[PDB]
């Protein structure tokens, strides 16, 4: 409803798919999924849980009474316990075995880790598409000379495609980082209130092996290759630093790229798509990318003051910054893909600017000729001042870019939103 | 709204309804049409002036809540001005303070915030009527070259919007430096609240003080015996976000090119509202905490008894010397007895028995009868209770005076 | 110092000698001794057993600091303040027993830091005022010089060079107001004792509260502060450090925006600082950025100070306070130098206006047409087609804007051909720009500069 | 340095001599000259008109740097690189004409910075490894020692001293993995020309692309890098600076958390950092670590901002910022690791205090064994809690065996140390013996 504040990330910017990943339906559904997996594995390992209790839970995974959970939360001041009661109300037989041996972080943290990994999996293809569209552009314009800029003053010629490779390289570094974080992300698993699994050890009457099995079993049900051995109550909040640092770095890359595009628009050498002509899409990318960089200080601060086995001063902050970083990243990648699909180049403006400055950039050619008038047209040919630019493009795209794009070949065809 | 898609936690969970509506979309387009009933304009005529109206309303909602927090803590500070408590530097036992004096550390920081929020609210200027690049060229042409009519128009809508003052100089926008000034003060407030709520969480570990806890409240899903400072922890958590947010407007302002670039717009839709919604939640939550603080004097007194003996050694020597003992002998004998008591505490896990040892040693016969008086906690608190009253009267109560009519409201939490 | 070990570029390269001296260890430890002397003086006046000869001994050795011996004491004790108490007591053997009487380390640590902060603000203020003044001269001189306006960095309604300069001046004036406010409202820690209770001083004056308050007020006045805290822990509240570095961070943002504009104006060839690269402006941006970054230090520090003090503030503050001020010092000096030597190229400014103004001017041309034979509709539609033709020449052929040539050639505009020079006159497109400049400078700028009139003449030098 | 002007406490107080030397001007300008020599060497080998005597002249004067003359040239020119070219040419009069042949300032500026960063990472890695190793010894030694667990800093189910130590070790191991990765993946700028096109070098080799690639690869190997960028502007991408300072910022957070825990353990009297006999016992070393670690976290916003506003092939608004933040991040990291090593070598534990605190909370720690049950114990627990706090009494679950209460803690320690920690320490086995000294 427009009568109260609504995040522009929900109402304006981010994709439906990313919005669903950070939704409360997906969150509390996944809590129930985790409670089911715990009960399943606990029964398999010999605890007194009946087939009918398990079926009851399985039938009501998505049957979530939000109104009743809010009333319980107002009464108890504990969101996890509110949802245990609410789940126990629609599963009266199972009510007594839900959450058996566990702490709130069993559902809280593991859900957050499932969410993070799904969210990374949504970002990766979009980033790959951005890189791919820019790679097409870079190849197509590999040989098109353009005035180089250092200190934003006229400098030795480069090419439009070579400059595009500066942007592509930064984005490829981001793709490498996002892949790494996604692949190295570990599950909290089943660890108990302070990470000792003391509760589960007592439930299995001192059988260490059964405890390790339980941990490994729910880890596999959730689709993770690996779980922590060491935790406190929580997974280490250093994980949140690693994830938001990579998104912050992506922010910087996008901000630089979109800043270049905005400058190229002033120069009239290049313009973003349009369905006075302003680079509004690039400006929005910069704007949002900035927020992405800002957000890195949240998890840095959070992790630095976590006392002992956990303090709850992480919780509210994480409800805000994790979702917003991903929703912001999602919007920037979509928007940048749309930009890269529709870039318009104006070679006659590019050539005119070179003609105005190239004379100053030469003179050394004219002296070398003198040492030995009719040659002047050939000596001021812009193509000869670009050094190895077009050769650099081809070598870079082949050796460094195309191999990173290979795994996303099947999803390349999707066109952007806006 | 729905739970089938993402909602901001500040909207769904934390934010007061008034502050929610201040950053509301309906409230934004009411203000936009209010501003056109008040034509050669640019988008920022409604965009920026609405944002300035919103900021000022939002500050006006925060101010009373902060004042109430200060007032509740001031009541607490007066009530406990003389209650001795162990001082802490490096979080090690240190010269005694009082519960109320410590509360004044918190009150002072919050008063500095109230001064800052008042200042920013009062000095906030209106963009007014300025045209596409701030030259008013459109309005000058509409009034066929009459400069005076243009200045009047600017001054007139400025007054209709309820601002004392408008910029002379703008580009298309009001300078985004204004956004730095507003979020810097909220960031500083964040730091104050984080420190205070961190102290409260430590006091809970020490069992000297606890935040309010409802009859039916559950601390933990797994440990039923637990009572956690979860309200204070949430305050810290949100206060941190408030500090983080200051880098948004700092960065935004630094890269605004010429008379305006639009890379401010999306960022400002996020950070301005969220800073105010975050501040709103923390003030309401901290008010609720301060209204319900529970103190445990018996624990406070026990901790003093355990540590005071070590603090008091200089008093005991001065007494011994006054009774005609030797500073050298006295110092050396206390030193040995102190290490013995220290080893009992650390190596045996026992109580501090230094007083028991001094009573048992016949070298201190001259001062045995003085020992109750020499270890009296009231004499170790210096000027603590006098500091409280002077501070409350000279520095705190005057800042609260304008909010006297709205002090009675209690702060509710539904989670 | 020596190039064989790391030196801060803020010391070795950037900041002024005067700011460097304010954050030096000589000034620091000299001021520790000054504060110990003031404490002894006031304590004697209020009746404590301190002789005139002990006071004179301390007064004679304020500058006589054995750094080698203080380092050896610090290696043995691991306490910098106590090391310096011993070292001071070694050259003042008679006074040794009464130095630091009743005090805690923060008596010298914090009060020195507050004296340093205030001196450092007093060095920044005039430099900022001079920057504002030089830009104000420039703004007045160029108040009427039309220049292309920029929104989204696209051509937009004309402004003037002086009016644009006022955007910069305004932000810097807000900084001057902020620095003045913080300087004036800065309070002294004074004499407060280990946990801020003054318990030690109360015992020294045998329970006389009034004598304790006078001691506090007396050393506060000797240090030259109008006001002291009533409430402290061991330290002054580290919120003070947030207030100071926030204002410097905001200044950073202002300077970064201004110097970014100047760098863009250099690309446009409309303006240059004193291949020609705007390296001074680029350095200002670079350093201004560090100034903005630094604000998160004190925000974090203050937020995790437990109870009456934790020492996790100390090392951080040795770095960030000095560096913020040294960075600010360099940026202001460098920006003053830039503003003193700005070179403008009006012929380039005029050429760029000629290229774009035709597109801006269509509304004037219609109003003239309506005033002649009329039809706003026909006029609008015919200009629209001719404008797209001229636009394609600019973008697709890389040519000059020929829209005026096309309007002269089209016989529909016969009624207004003779008006065209006057209708495209840049002076009439600048709205109230020059009037805004004069009103702003008089009402808002000159009054803030008035107190710094005597120090305006100093030129800002650069050695690299 | 002299105390009459401001000096960085990172130089004058905190960081090691070795890290200070790496960020010194002697090492910087010495390395500029080294890079000019390598360029001349490779250029001669590839056929450019450079004599053996010109190369010798340069090689003899690598360390012979006239700082006074370079400052005078820099005041005259306002270009530090060109000042040093003139100054170097002044002592190698024969070579003067071929110094910097074909190159741009970033050839010496950036490549030196990349050599410095790599060396600096190589100094940090062993110190971090030693910290992890000392804590690993401690963790094994105390794997079975029960201690009160803390969540929300309230008493919670028992852990062990060694298991808690593994929380710290894990975070630090993640840092070691990150520092290794960044060190190994760091690429050289190499030889790239004013705008990264190598146009100058292409013209010098009369259009021979292959010779240009060889030159790049040759100086890259002389500098000891496996790999160089293909793509650059004038500079290496400043995103590299984000990657390096992000990892150091994350390390800062880890150290801050650890040292915060230690400071809390000191209040509880369960554990204390080392003290020097001649030194109330405060955790001042841990407090300094926190203090400096904070600065390390703060610094990450410098390179994030810098990279985001680099226009086109380069803008010079990176330069001053990088002179400050790169050195300071590494010097700050250096100090924190050395100081934390010293702390971990001297940790003192007080088991009798640990045991007493457990005895005081034990009734609550048996509730997990005993577990609508929850609700009951909750009401009876608040009743017992009020007796403790409001009446000052013992915890009484009259209202209602230590051995099971630490769960799998000691087993977790052994599995973690063996599977995850010891393998990361293996390469640093030869340098483990060094003790970490502090002078203040
Ligand atoms: N308000 C503008 C401006 C502007 O003010 N000035 C124009 C002229 C004018 O609008 O009067 C100029 O070129 O000077 N440009 C874009 N927009 C709009 O900004 C909105 C973009 O939302 P975003 O997601 O980027 O925050 C969205 O509502 C629009 O894109
Ligand atoms: N100033 C103190 C304080 C303190 O205030 N102590 C009180 C008593 C108390 O607070 O317990 C006193 O007056 O003695 N504690 C340490 N230090 C010293 O601070 C120095 C810290 O240097 P760092 O490297 O951490 O910046 C370092 O040289 C010193 O350790
Ligand atoms: N290194 C350069 C560059 C540059 O890379 N220029 C190219 C050419 C070009 O891109 O235009 C070149 O090969 O020289 N420009 C300046 N300077 C110099 O950098 C010094 C910067 O000082 P700062 O105080 O900002 O760190 C300062 O002493 C010098 O200005
Ligand atoms: N895991 C825990 O220790 C824990 N302790 C309390 N809680 C509950 O989680 C919620 C936290 O909300 P917030 O993130 O706003 O602090 C509250 O309902 C609180 O009782 C937990 N999840
Ligand atoms: O809710 C839980 O399970 C844990 C709470 C706590 O550790 O206090
Ligand atoms: Cl669990
Ligand atoms: Cl307007
Ligand atoms: Cl004092
Ligand atoms: Cl090069």
| D107 alpha carbon – ligand 9 mean position (Å) | 4
CATH annotation of D102-371+401-439: 1.20.200.10
Are the C-beta atoms of residues C137 and C413 closer than 8 Å to each other?
A: no
List ligand 5's pocket residues with C-beta within 6 A: A 80, 103-104, 193, 233; B 219-223, 226, 228; D 151-152, 156
Say how far apart CA A271 and CA A195 lie, in whole Å.
55
Are the C-beta atoms of residues D333 and D297 closer than 8 Å to each other?
A: no
Chain C residue numbers touching B382 (CB-CB < 8 A): 193, 195, 197-202
Chain D residue numbers touching A241 (CB-CB < 8 A): 249-250, 253
Catalytic residue among B2, B43, B82, B90: B90
D286 touches chain A (CB under 8 A): no
Chain D residue numbers touching B347 (CB-CB < 8 A): 350, 352
Pairing of strands C271-272, C154-160: unpaired
Task: Establish whether B220 is a catalytic residue.
Answer: yes
Q: Which two tokens stand for residue B55?
A: 């900021």
Give A380's contacts (C-beta < 8 A, 6+ positions apart).
A358, A359, A362, A365
User: Are B267 and A291 within 8 A, CB to CB?
Assistant: yes
Closest-approach residue (CA) in chain A for D303? A252
> In degrees to the nearest 10, what's the CA dihedral of C319, C325, C331, C336?
-160
Residue nearest atom 14 in ligand 1 by C-alpha distance: C151
Question: What are the CA-CA distances from residue D65 to residues A374, C464, D30, D109 (Å)?
Answer: 48, 19, 8, 17
Domains B40-325+367-414 and B326-366 alike in fold: no
DSSP string spanning A126-185? Answer: HHHHHHHHHHHHHHHTTT-EEEEEETTEEEEEEEHHHHHHHHHHHHHHHHHHHHHHHHHP
Task: Establish whether B90 is a catalytic residue.
Answer: yes
Question: What are the CA-CA distances from residue C373 to residues C363, C382, C410, D175 (Å)?
Answer: 16, 15, 16, 79
* Best residue for ligand 1 mutational test, from A266, A278, A283, A289 (most atoms within 8 Å of Cβ): A278
Q: Which two tokens stand for residue C324?
A: 């913020």
Nearest to D271 by CA among D285, D292, D289: D285
| B230 alpha carbon – ligand 6 mean position (Å) | 20
Ligand nearest the Cα of residue A191 is 6
Q: What residues pair up with C150 in beta bridges, in sequence order?
A: C155
Architecture of the domain spanning B326-366: Helix non-globular (6.10)
User: Are C7 and D25 within 8 A, CB to CB?
Assistant: yes
Write the residue in D301, D385, D392 that is nearest to B247 by C-beta: D301
Q: What residues pair up with C161 in beta bridges, in sequence order?
A: none
Q: Which two tokens stand for residue D234?
A: 């004038």
Residue whose structure tokens are 């304008």: B402
Architecture of the domain spanning A101-418: Up-down Bundle (1.20)
* Burial state string for B365-380 with b = 16 or more CB within 10 A and e = fewer than 16: eebeebbeebbebebb
* Best residue for ligand 5 mutational test, from B218, B219, B232 (most atoms within 8 Å of Cβ): B219
DSSP string spanning A233-258? Answer: SS--THHHHHHHHHHHHHHHHHHHHH
Give D177's contacts (C-beta < 8 A, 6+ positions apart).
D424
The finding on whether B272 has its CB within 6 A of some atom of ligand 1 is no
- Name the helix (H) or strand (E) containing C34: helix C25-45
Nearest to A244 by CA among A199, A191, A201, A302: A302
Please state the three-class secondary structure of D277-292 as a single string.
CCCCCCCHHHHHHHHH
Gapped junctions in chain B, after residues (C–N > 2.5 Å):
38
Pick among 3.40.50.1100, 1.10.275.10, 1.10.3720.10, 3.65.10.10: CATH of A1-100: 1.10.275.10
C154 touches chain A (CB under 8 A): yes
What is the count of residue pairs from B and C with beta carbons less than 8 Å apart? 258
Q: How many residues does chain A have?
A: 418
Neighbours of chain D (3+ CB pairs under 8 A): A, B, C
| B273 alpha carbon – ligand 1 mean position (Å) | 19
Residue whose structure tokens are 């976000």: B241
Nearest to C313 by CA among A317, B191, B7, A164: B191
The CB density around residue B122, as the number of other CB atoms within 10 Å, is 11
Output Rg (C-alpha) for chain B, integer angstroms.
29
Residue nearest atom 4 in ligand 2 by C-alpha distance: C105
Nearest to C365 by CA among C351, C353, C376: C376
Q: What is the largest CA-CA distance in chain C?
A: 105
Q: Which two tokens stand for residue D273?
A: 């950092």
Tell me which method was used to determine the 3D structure: X-ray
Q: φ and ψ at B49, to 5 degrees?
A: -65, -40
The finding on whether C194 has its CB within 6 A of some atom of ligand 2 is yes
* Structural fold of domain B40-325+367-414: Fumarase C; Chain A, domain 2 (1.20.200)
Instruction: Please report the residues numbered 317 through 376 in chain C whose beta carbons come closer than 8 angstroms to any beta carbon of chain B.
Output: none
**Beta strand residue intervals within B4-138, DSSP E:** 84-89, 92-98
Catalytic residue among B220, B254, B265, B379: B220
Q: How many residues does chain D have?
A: 440
Pick among 1.10.3720.10, 3.40.190.10, 3.20.20.100, 1.10.275.10: CATH of C8-101: 1.10.275.10
Closest-approach residue (CA) in chain D for A400? D230
Residue nearest atom 24 in ligand 3 by C-alpha distance: D320
Question: B80-84 long-range contacts, Cβ below 8 Å, gap at least 24?
Answer: B80/B295, B81/B384, B81/B385, B81/B388, B81/B389, B82/B378, B82/B381, B82/B384, B82/B385, B83/B295, B83/B297, B83/B300, B84/B300, B84/B304, B84/B377, B84/B378, B84/B380, B84/B381, B84/B384
Chain C residue numbers touching B87 (CB-CB < 8 A): 194-195, 197, 307-308
Return the residue in A194, A199, A262, A369 with the most chain D beta carbons within 10 A, the one to mutate for interface testing: A194
C398 touches chain A (CB under 8 A): yes
Domain regions of chain D by residue span: 8-101, 102-371+401-439, 372-400
Architecture of the domain spanning D372-400: Helix non-globular (6.10)
User: Are A388 and D257 within 8 A, CB to CB?
Assistant: no
Output Rg (C-alpha) for chain C, integer angstroms.
31
Give A289's contacts (C-beta < 8 A, 6+ positions apart).
A250, A251, A252, A254, A255, A258, A328, A332, D308
* Burial state string for A377-390 with b = 16 or more CB within 10 A and e = fewer than 16: eeebebebbbbbbb
Say how far apart CA B186 and CA C282 lie, in whole Å.
31
Give D181's contacts (C-beta < 8 A, 6+ positions apart).
none
Q: Which two tokens stand for residue C48?
A: 């404590």
DSSP label at residue C29: H
Residue whose structure tokens are 């941006």: C285
Q: How many Cα atoms within 13 Å fall on the side-chain side of residue A375? A: 9
Say how far apart CA A93 and CA C40 lie, in whole Å.
79
Q: φ and ψ at D150, to 5 degrees?
A: -135, 120
Say how far apart CA B327 and CA B325 lie, in whole Å.
7
CATH annotation of C102-374+416-464: 1.20.200.10
DSSP-derived 3-state class of residue B88: strand
User: Are B192 and C295 within 8 A, CB to CB?
Assistant: no
State CA A363 to chain mean position distance.
49
The finding on whether C310 has its CB within 6 A of some atom of ligand 2 is no
> What is the structure's resolution, reported in angstroms to one decimal?
2.4
**Beta strand residue intervals within C230-312, DSSP E:** 271-272
CATH annotation of C375-415: 6.10.250.1570
A292 touches chain D (CB under 8 A): no
Are the C-beta atoms of residues B113 and C302 closer than 8 Å to each other?
A: no
Say how far apart CA A260 and CA A254 lie, in whole Å.
10
Q: Which two tokens stand for residue D190?
A: 């190499």
DSSP-derived 3-state class of residue A187: strand
C76 touches chain D (CB under 8 A): yes
Nearest to C61 by CA among C81, C33, C85, C83: C33
User: Percentages helix, strand, coil for chain A, rounded to the nearest 5?
Assistant: 65, 5, 30
Say how far apart CA C352 and CA C354 lie, in whole Å.
5
Neighbours of chain B (3+ CB pairs under 8 A): A, C, D
Are the C-beta atoms of residues A352 and A145 closer than 8 Å to each other?
A: no
Give B148's contacts (C-beta < 8 A, 6+ positions apart).
none
Residue nearest atom 5 in ligand 5 by C-alpha distance: B220
| C105 alpha carbon – ligand 2 mean position (Å) | 7
Q: Which two tokens stand for residue D8?
A: 């960085």
Q: Which two tokens stand for residue C26?
A: 């000589």
| A211 alpha carbon – ligand 6 mean position (Å) | 11
Nearest to C228 by CA among B390, B103, B118: B390
| B161 alpha carbon – ligand 7 mean position (Å) | 14
DSSP label at residue B126: B
Are the C-beta atoms of residues D400 and D380 closer than 8 Å to each other?
A: yes
Say how far apart CA B149 and CA B160 lie, in whole Å.
16
């Amino acid at each position: 409803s427009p009568d109260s504040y609504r995040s522009p990330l929900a109402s304006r910017y981010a994709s439906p798919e990313m919005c669903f990943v950070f939704s409360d339906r997906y969150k509390f559904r996944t809590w129930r999924q985790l409670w089911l997996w715990l009960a399943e594995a606990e029964q398999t390992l010999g605890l007194p849980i009946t087939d009918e209790q398990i079926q009851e839970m399985k039938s009501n995974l998505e049957n979530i009474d939000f109104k009743m959970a809010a009333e319980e939360e107002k009464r108890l001041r504990h969101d996890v316990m509110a949802h245990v009661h609410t789940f126990g109300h629609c599963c009266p037989k199972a009510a007594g075995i839900i959450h058996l041996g566990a702490t709130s972080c069993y559902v809280g943290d593991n859900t957050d880790l499932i969410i993070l990994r799904n969210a990374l999996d949504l970002l990766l293809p979009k980033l790959a598409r951005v890189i791919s569209r820019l790679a097409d552009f870079a190849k197509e314009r590999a040989s098109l000379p353009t005035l180089g800029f250092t200190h934003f003053q006229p400098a030795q010629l480069t090419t439009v495609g070579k400059r595009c490779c500066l942007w592509i390289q930064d984005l490829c570094m981001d793709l490498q980082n996002l892949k790494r974080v996604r692949d190295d992300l570990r599950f909290r698993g089943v660890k108990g209130t302070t990470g000792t699994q003391a509760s589960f050890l007592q439930l299995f009457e001192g059988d260490d092996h059964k405890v390790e099995q339980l941990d490994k079993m729910v880890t596999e049900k959730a689709g993770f290759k690996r779980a922590f051995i060491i935790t406190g109550q929580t997974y280490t909040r250093k994980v949140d630093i690693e994830v938001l640092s990579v998104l912050a770095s992506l922010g910087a890359s996008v901000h630089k790229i979109c800043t270049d595009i905005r400058l190229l628009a002033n120069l009239k050498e290049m313009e973003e798509p349009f369905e006075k002509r302003n680079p509004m899409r690039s400006e929005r990318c910069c704007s949002l990318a900035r927020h992405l960089m800002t957000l890195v200080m949240d998890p840095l601060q959070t992790a630095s003051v976590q006392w002992f086995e956990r303090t709850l001063d992480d919780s509210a902050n994480r409800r805000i910054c994790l979702a917003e970083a991903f929703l912001t990243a999602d919007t920037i990648l979509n928007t940048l893909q749309n930009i890269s699909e529709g870039l318009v180049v104006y070679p006659k403006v590019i050539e005119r600017r070179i003609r105005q400055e190239l004379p100053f950039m030469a003179t050394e050619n004219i002296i070398m000729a003198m040492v030995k008038h009719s040659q002047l047209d050939h000596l001021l040919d812009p193509s000869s001042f670009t050094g190895r630019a077009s050769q650099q493009v081809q070598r870079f795209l082949e050796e460094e870019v195309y191999p990173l794009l290979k795994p996303y070949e099947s999803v390349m065809k999707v066109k952007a939103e806006l």
